[model samples]
Target: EITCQENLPFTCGNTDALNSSSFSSDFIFGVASSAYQIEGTIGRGLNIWDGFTHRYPNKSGPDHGNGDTTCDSFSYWQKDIDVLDELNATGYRFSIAWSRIIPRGKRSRGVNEKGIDYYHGLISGLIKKGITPFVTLFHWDLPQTLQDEYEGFLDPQIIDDFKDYADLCFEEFGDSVKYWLTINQLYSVPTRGYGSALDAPGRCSPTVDPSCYAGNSSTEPYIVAHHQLLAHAKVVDLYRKNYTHQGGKIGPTMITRWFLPYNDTDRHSIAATERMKEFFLGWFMGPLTNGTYPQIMIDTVGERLPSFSPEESNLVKGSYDFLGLNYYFTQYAQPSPNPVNSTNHTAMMDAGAKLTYINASGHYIGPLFEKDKADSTDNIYYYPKGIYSVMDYFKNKYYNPLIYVTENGISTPGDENRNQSMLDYTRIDYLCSHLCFLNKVIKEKDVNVKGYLAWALGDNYEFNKGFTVRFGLSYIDWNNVTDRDLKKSGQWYQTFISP
Candidate 1:
């Protein structure tokens, strides 16, 4: 059994309260933020997100577009550090802006000295203040030149290009940044870019005009994901070979929502749950853990999903040192099978056996299961129970790999006053409940789970939803431009971290 550190006040416990002997003090606690969401200023380099916002101004809320000066944190790094310092945070998780660093996305074009100096200062500042830095390389900000020339991740050429970029990061920052995340969320980029038109390069052509060049196409999302997987694997391989000697670890973060079948007895519902897992989680996890895309994905999407060459498949498998998971809400999935001959392959219909449906209460039931009419808050159930189930599922299914809870938090409509109280109580309850389960798995089940990181530090722009949904512990006054107030949730987390 793993031993616990006695001096640390926080202890992991299962359902039953435990003595210090039952838990370890090695747990990691920190808050997260993305460069595009938080970093102000636009002309440093063009990102796909910037292009999307500029092209489709109305896609976000009425007056929202780009996060050019969203939180103005670009000029307030010291203030951000103060927030971290106030929390007594052990680490701070942030992403390096790709465009901000390399400017043109080309290695030979020359590195931006200003960009290098900026990150050098930031990393040095964090270390000076006694905070460990967890750096994410690419957090959805694709250098615009790549998107313009090579169709971004949709083009397989990105494999080599990304490797070069990773090499640069390792050569420069690998010394101080011991923990590195290669990509934030692989699926979110391609899925949002191609399927929903909700994010950057907002191309929602799939549901509208099939013949339009930038519109939705069946092969784009899968193709994009395939390249991303290969890119992640290549970067991890590079880090393992070169940076391990320098003591750095690298992995990719994947965002997956937990899905439960609404009906216990329905066969279609059962099939749908499996389909949802295969489509969402398996899309990345299957290859990373088992070395190939899930057969279920191939069978379900057929021609719409692209197949990787054997050479490409080898690169995509076993790419991560640990699994970085970002889980928010759990939903019941119900089956919504489409006619076999339908040409479309949306997340709800084509990629899996079941489509998701929201109940009257706004909760999503599993693929085929229908929500009971009497349940009011079924749609938005904040079930932390699934977090443990998911951890166990990965532990058993993937040979008990090391795991990190990269992102887990709740979002609420900003105008409601109850939003603050609801977020605070619910977030604390969620963390306590999930951590309790994690404690059980570690102490009892002996799973290899390592640490947890919250979704965000301060409020920033939320894509598509714009700033309407507040997910940060520190709320930003959009109108005031410089005011950042730590909510009750932030204060509570500070206490949790301190202990």
Candidate 2:
């Protein structure tokens, strides 16, 4: 068995204690990255990311780092495959930029053959190296034209446009790519992009962010989220109905986190935790699993949340053959005010919970997962057991659908010297501890999790943080982007995967 020190909650560092052999033989192990986060804005049409970063350079990163030439994956995709081959990775979860394929956002505007060729090259390379490609059709990098023409996901016009774009992807790559993810994370764009204006297509109530040109935080988020579900279901329907001969499984990706009560003994705190789960997860899972919004959300959000018609409900329900879940750290939830009448009110506030890494008793959740460079108190902590709890809950609550851990990893400061950066013991501990729990959940609860993909393949342009933090298993020299030297954790993972 792998020997984790006695103090830690799970085994880590020792592969012999738990390795790939611990899971089913067919289980996939690899790394993940999104198009906007990695691919440079070269040979592609403008996306929301390009617009957001240029409009608010300060929000992009402290150093104003943008994805102009991120690892130049367009030119060095072979290097990526080489690294995966070196690590003996069995799968790779990467996304296609919609602007890259259909720059103008409308399929009738014409397709980019070179853009299609670029993905064709990347997909072919992975298949040649015996790596399964889990392709994501859209990872929040909506083409700028659609945003301008119809406010993107805020309008139903996006439903047909998105379906057309997905149709092109399937027609071109479905033969080779068997695992398709419709959306990156069901909760991200609507909340972060519209509610808080933190990510691309930044839109929020004027009071929420004066920089945003136009948006209603309370109303726009629900509209955007509703459209996303409809768009996803439409794509899933098209894939199954038309591309059935391709024999691929399609599903939506979720950004998942297990929630805990801030005060175990406080009844309010315990109740808040349950409400947070429904608000956070059930907002989307409710419609996907059943054909309606969660009863709690319908009650709290009232008319702000849209109701699906009988036909739309039937289309959305059971749209996926599997689920793509991304897990990070867990948080403690306590009650918070829901000022629905305030001008600055947001859909997120409907959750009625204040989350923190530390509990009411002043105990940290687990090891430090993220360090906030600007604010020391804003750092995040991790809990290995949270992965176990999340998996078990999904199994019992979400009908025990098949799942793949699409993205999971910790980040290190970007200022560290190359040598110090390469010796990433913290990354090793973070990855292994979570893996231990993933294995435990599968064996204990028989949750049908088929794969695990770490957060990144190599250091690239992280969306908001830019180059300020490194989440890659391999270290990349920003000056010499060609070199992807495996860090200590990557080397450990190589052995763990093959040994």
Candidate 3:
């Protein structure tokens, strides 16, 4: 068991003496946001999200479509900055809309000065306020032109085209932005959008013509991810060779949900845990860290998987300075004899992994821990200790690279205060537990952990769930448009930052 000197071991200040103020001044505090999630305009450029939201509004919400007026940040960026200032944030992680900057998704057409100016202005504003900007080149918003003309990630040609986009961002923003995340969670985009039909580009069947979804064939997800990995590597290579002359760092962000076996004695359960690690997390990190895909994934997924050429393989390896991890929840993994493997359907289900129930509480516990399962809402079991296990796993499997918690926060139903105490207490406990675990990794295990950034500053449009699931430090009145109220958790986070 991990213990601290204070009553609340998880509290940021009480975690360890090393993290105490008297020891170091290098930790970072920041809030994160995505362009599609927060930017409330759709027609600025054609993106797969725009196409999906327009084509299938029912998948999102009866009243939801795109974030054209979301938090109205396009016009109220200054107000958004005020929230960051209030939180005492030192860094900001945001994305550049591919379609917004290159409306045609082609370089020959020339860059969009208006879009460039917007990001330049935003970065300048943040710098003026003494906040460093961490820019992501792609965050699941592929230019509509590319999807329409080239079938998006399905086309290997996208590797070069994405390089073009990355180059433009480097040339334009590298002067001010030092940290660059080339791609964000490569699996979620293809899985949820095309495979699961839960997000934008809601195509359930990919076997048909104009297949927006990558088919159930493992080859499809592997192929798409291959391109994404190659694209990240190409961009990292570009930054290392060209942009580093100007002093810039480039990397990619991956989302990982910890998993635990339902029964430690069950071989299937153990295999499921290993499979989840191999397919979900290792699918990307394996290549990025070790220059090859995990052996288990290659064996299980078989010929359905895609292989990289020698040139592409070398590029994909050693492409990042650190790992940007977005952790949320964990689930128990039980092997399903009859896995839902359908090619006509979305990618998530095609992978043939089903989450199983562990207890009568109907609470799903991943192959990790069981803390206070009753308090875990949103159909997810909250086990903060799993985060420590994940960090330790990564540290042992790969080089002890710096790790960044790019996104970590909870979601509540609706944007109300009825469950304020429960929600805030849950969040505070979650943050404290995870940070304390991270503190242990850093101080005792000697892990090279860097810092963390919360999922968002305020509740905005939550993709398909719309305004129903609130995952923000600040709450925005979807009805009022201008009424942004800071939640108690937000205040607690501010206090944590001040200390």
TM-score winner: 2
Task: Give the runs in model 3 whose Cα sits over 4 Å from its true position.
Answer: 1-24, 62-65, 206-219, 338-352, 357-378, 415-423
CA lDDT of every candidate: 0.70, 0.91, 0.71
Q: Which ranges of candidate 2 are over 4 A from the true structure?
A: 1-11
- lDDT by residue for model 3 (1-499), tens: 4453222334453323323242237877777898877766643687887777777666665456466667877666777778888888887888888887898898778778888888888898898888878788998888888887877787888988998988898898888998889889867766676455676555445453244443443345556777888878988998898888768667789888777776767887877777777778888999998778888767666675678888888888899987888887666676654332644433344334566445325544432222323354434456666667778888887788778778877776663554562255555555556666666666667777677788787877777766666777877767666655667767777777775
Q: Name the candidate, 2 or 3, with the larger TM-score value.
A: 2
Q: What would the TM-scores of all predictions be?
A: 0.87, 0.98, 0.88
Ten contiguous residues with the weakest lDDT in model 3: 365-374
Candidate order by lDDT, decreasing, is 2, 3, 1
